[PDB]
């Protein structure tokens, strides 16, 4: 089904992670590799020549074993096995292109973007800038019945295109935490500083487990009812960057083959919510995607000619880690009272909904 897309999309996950952390050392991170991946793949459908191979290589594709034509259809297959799943699990993902009203959009592009990526573009008046932000923030607002803040805040009048994507999640643990078991406990920002958080607990729990003596970390798999699972990576004290500098597909694959079911006595995991907005222009520059931002840009697939450059690329990701899963409620010891990593991956296609580091559960 998804053998070659998944390997590209795990690779992109980690080089994205590596960059985001470099931007914000010792700070929380959350983002969606899958969501950003479909975004830059959607941009690539309107790309040509150097602007196009720059996006595809940056998405970590090998353009000697695959082609633009095959990627566009490998993603459409992927995107539609996610729209198959039941309402055990619900992935609310958004992918929008806002283009300067002057430039016409061939109905060839808005067409393909629909049937291939479920996304679309809209004409936009970036001269009335305040109302521009008005209706782009309104698009992200519609990813949740919940109310969220503003993703676009400062928008230049001479903006050509803003590309927007967001991700919202809804699932249930196979093994929910009991709220009666959720207690106040310490979370150790450092070996000497700490903070009080809600601490979810389970006891006498047989779940996939692996103690990595090599990388000095501990890995557990918490399943959702849908065909996804949460990977939780508890690095030893003072060893997060050694774990961080080993992250890669090969490392993730090793953890995946090394997990074994194990009875665990007690499991302690913070009850928390994590959400981040990013402007990704710097990070995509770092990843080799230059021509799409310059005058050298060849997005002629969108407009019919080379009149168009990416101005802003914005991502928003929102995860809840509660007792029943995403929704709130009415002896081997694994205690996540320390900065840790969290990787939520889908079992059908092997892609990564969320990639996250929690250095502080309410911050």
UniProtKB/Swiss-Prot annotation:
The terms under GO molecular function for this entry are:
DNA binding; serine-type endopeptidase inhibitor activity
PTM summary from the entry reads: N- and O-glycosylated.
InterPro entries from the UniProt entry:
Serpin_CS (IPR023795), Serpin_dom (IPR023796), Serpin_fam (IPR000215), Serpin_sf (IPR036186), Serpin_sf_1 (IPR042178), Serpin_sf_2 (IPR042185)
Per the UniProt entry, the glycosylated residues are 49, 62, 83, 142, 227
- What subunit structure does UniProt give? Interacts with DNAJC1.
Q: What is known of its domains?
A: The reactive center loop (RCL) extends out from the body of the protein and directs binding to the target protease. The protease cleaves the serpin at the reactive site within the RCL, establishing a covalent linkage between the carboxyl group of the serpin reactive site and the serine hydroxyl of the protease. The resulting inactive serpin-protease complex is highly stable.
Q: What does this protein's UniProt record list under function?
A: Although its physiological function is unclear, it can inhibit neutrophil cathepsin G and mast cell chymase, both of which can convert angiotensin-1 to the active angiotensin-2.
| Protein name in UniProt | Alpha-1-antichymotrypsin
Q: What is the lineage of its organism?
A: Eukaryota, Metazoa, Chordata, Craniata, Vertebrata
């Amino acid at each position: 089904v998804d053998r070659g897309l998944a390997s590209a999309n795990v690779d992109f996950a980690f080089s994205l992670y590596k960059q985001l952390v470099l931007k914000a050392p010792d700070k929380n991170v959350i983002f969606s590799p899958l969501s950003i991946s479909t975004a830059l793949a959607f941009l690539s459908l309107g790309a040509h020549n150097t602007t196009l191979t720059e996006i595809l290589k940056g998405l970590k594709f090998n353009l000697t074993e695959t082609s633009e034509a095959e990627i566009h259809q490998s993603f459409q297959h992927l995107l539609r096995t996610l729209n198959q799943s039941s309402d055990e699990l619900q992935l609310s993902m958004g992918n929008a292109m806002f283009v300067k009203e002057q430039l016409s959009l061939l109905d060839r592009f808005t067409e393909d973007a629909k049937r291939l990526y479920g996304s679309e573009a809209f004409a936009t008046d970036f001269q009335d800038s305040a109302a521009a932000k008005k209706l782009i923030n309104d698009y992200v607002k519609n990813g949740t019945r919940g109310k969220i803040t503003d993703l676009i805040k400062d928008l230049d009048s001479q903006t050509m295109m803003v590309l927007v994507n967001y991700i919202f999640f809804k699932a249930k643990w196979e093994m929910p935490f009991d709220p009666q078991d959720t207690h106040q406990s310490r979370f150790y920002l450092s070996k000497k500083k700490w903070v009080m958080v809600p601490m979810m607990s389970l006891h006498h729990l047989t779940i996939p487990y692996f103690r990595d003596e090599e990388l000095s970390c501990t890995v557990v798999q918490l399943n959702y009812t849908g065909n996804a699972s949460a990977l939780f990576i508890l690095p030893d004290q003072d060893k997060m960057e050694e774990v961080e500098a080993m992250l890669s597909r090969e490392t993730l694959n090793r953890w995946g083959d090394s997990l074994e079911f194990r009875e665990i006595g007690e499991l302690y995991l913070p009850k928390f919510s994590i959400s981040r907005d990013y402007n990704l222009n710097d990070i995509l520059l770092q990843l080799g995607i230059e021509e799409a931002f310059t005058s050298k840009a060849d997005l002629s697939g969108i407009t019919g000619a080379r009149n168009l450059a990416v101005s802003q690329v914005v991502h928003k990701a929102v995860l809840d880690v509660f007792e029943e899963g995403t929704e709130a409620s009415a002896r081997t010891i694994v205690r996540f009272n320390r900065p840790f990593l969290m990787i939520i991956v889908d079992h059908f296609t092997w892609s990564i909904f969320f990639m996250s580091k929690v250095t502080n559960p309410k911050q």
